[PDB]
Design a protein around this ligand. Structure first.
Ligand code: SDS
Length: 129
């Protein structure tokens, strides 16, 4: 499903992602936009043979099992296909494990390249949250 900006924020914020680990809602929404364009069904295969899945493009090398990433790990105990659902719950939950790994939201390269140090408050501008 292709979420609207404010709808996604509300879901994100409904699931305890606002200010999680220090990153305000705008941060998580900004990443969604630039990772998947708010599309819970986006997939993107990496050079190394892994694939990023979902609203937040969670990588199969570490957090999910897709059956085609040899030597990879499945840290949030879940099938990568669960990351593609209209219900963002699994994504958020795994986002919470990734974001705690040690590098914060830098795990999402497109957050640091396109969100970090920006006015991430604008992504939730106008939302009734
Ligand atoms: C060659 C296929 C690989 C597909 C993608 C991810 C691999 C999942 C394997 C489980 C490791 C278990 O990980 S665990 O930390 O949750 O116990």
């Amino acid at each position: 499903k292709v979420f609207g900006r404010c709808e996604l924020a509300a879901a994100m914020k409904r699931h305890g992602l606002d200010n999680y680990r220090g990153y305000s809602l705008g941060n998580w929404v900004c990443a969604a936009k630039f990772e998947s364009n708010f599309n819970t069904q986006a997939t993107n295969r990496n050079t190394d043979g892994s694939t990023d899945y979902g609203i937040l493009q969670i990588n199969s090398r570490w957090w999910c099992n897709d059956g085609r990433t040899p030597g990879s790990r499945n840290l949030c105990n879940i099938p990568c296909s669960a990351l593609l659902s209209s219900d963002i719950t699994a994504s958020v939950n795994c986002a919470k494990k990734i974001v705690s790994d040690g590098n914060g939201m830098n795990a999402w390269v497109a957050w640091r390249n396109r969100c970090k140090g920006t006015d991430v408050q604008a992504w939730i501008r106008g939302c009734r949250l």
